Design a protein around this ligand. Sequence first.
Ligand code: ZN
Ligand code: ZN
Length: 575
Amino acid sequence: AEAPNMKIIGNRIERIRSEHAETWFFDENHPYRTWAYHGSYEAPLINGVVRLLSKPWDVVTGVTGIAPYGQQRVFKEKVDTRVPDPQEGTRQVMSMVSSWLWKELGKHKRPRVCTKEEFINKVRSVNDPRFWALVDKEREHHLRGECQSCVYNMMGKRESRAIWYMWLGARFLEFEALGFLNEDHWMGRENSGGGVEGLGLQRLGYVLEEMSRIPGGRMYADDTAGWDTRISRFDLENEALITNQMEKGHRALALAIIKYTYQNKVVKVLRPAEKGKTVMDIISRQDQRGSGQVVTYALNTFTNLVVQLIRNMEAEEVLEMQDLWLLRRSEKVTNWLQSNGWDRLKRMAVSGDDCVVKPIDDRFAHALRFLNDMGKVRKDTQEWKPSTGWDNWEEVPFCSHHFNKLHLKDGRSIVVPCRHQDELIGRARVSPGAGWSIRETACLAKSYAQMWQLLYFHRRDLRLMANAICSSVPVDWVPTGRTTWSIHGKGEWMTTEDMLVVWNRVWIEENDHMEDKTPVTKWTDIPYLGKREDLWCGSLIGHRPRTTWAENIKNTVNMVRRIIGDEEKYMDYLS
Ligand SMILES: [Zn+2]
Ligand SMILES: [Zn+2]
């Protein structure tokens, strides 16, 4: 039951109402329980190239399944929930660890205001002075302690999650104030110990293998049930402690982003109305993370590091059950942080809401009191049932992948990323936005295929499908679009450079975990997973329709070349 601060959100609700004053109404039968409701108003694709080249997966539901009533279903199940406040001692511990962590991350880095030029340069991955006049107007309100237009448009996706969109101008104001966390890699492994920001998916496995060698208990990788919805008002205040390291001007800009965008959010959501009509509801909420913000990932990484440090302190018996209610003496916490903090950070791989921890023993498994009091409840497990850890690092889930050690034909080991193949093909078959020419569709298909060549070459079906896609798209067409939104997708495949040369730069030359720098001169030297592992992770090798697809692949490529244009230049990546 939300108690809104009308002094902070009132201006935004009035600005929305002024835009839709003639259809605005108050629906006393609205469905919101934990969100404050303010009023309502009246409101109003498959990648063909990848589909044609992945026929066996037309009947695989794990693939095709990936492509207002639905949006309300997600809101009700996932977002319309309230977690009790942690106890005072739990909150004192949270603030202490956050303050200590912020000071560690800022020891060799300084907060800075990000510029309009940096933002414009990123948008090329804004030209109208009127856009910047609206931005200036909102910034002036922010510097006076007001907010008129930083409103979320929350779109639900029932597959399930909510994406909280914001206008480009509000995203710039957030980037200007807090973009330094991303732009200057505050969560990079070197700066944070436990973070992995800036590492590609190609390096994450080696991190987990390094952690497997640190003496201790099992490796724990518990997923929080709906992380963003479990970010409390107290996590938000602890995250805001970075403002204490900012110069006065910068500080004013950030305190306004934190107050209005993070801690007193105004959101517009769609809802079905009578006879096919749709209404827009204006709702507000003080806690939770607004999924989609410029620093969502960085602040999720920060708070997850804080939570894992607290769990280790409880496991190691630094914190006791008396400390939840009130932390009487805090010296023990400061001592553990100053003495062991860095060792424990280096024992973690934290990427937003995903974590892997290598505690000093298995007491970590039953250290749940502080974790549960902070509302960071583990997914698919009884609240008080001890966590299950892993003995084999190659089976540890992290960033929706697991990592396996394979060997090149010359004997050198490599550590590769892997996930269930259905998710990979399913995502490649999704085309965002409609009306694309065969150029945009084929260029996005080519991006997916070259991404698989660099990272998932060890999957039989993907190496074959990637080669058929690359043989069906003109060689000179530059890959375009976004294959992934993950910060671990560094885009080395977004090029017309030969992918075997790119593979060598990523896996050999620039790979600090590849001692011998001898180049790999042929794709047949690059291994696949064993057939057992390829099948476990969704391969269709040996399955009749896939066998027919592979036997007919040259005919399928020729058909795609015929559609695109037989006069274009193609290369045979299959032979
Ligand atoms: Zn604002
Ligand atoms: Zn796998």
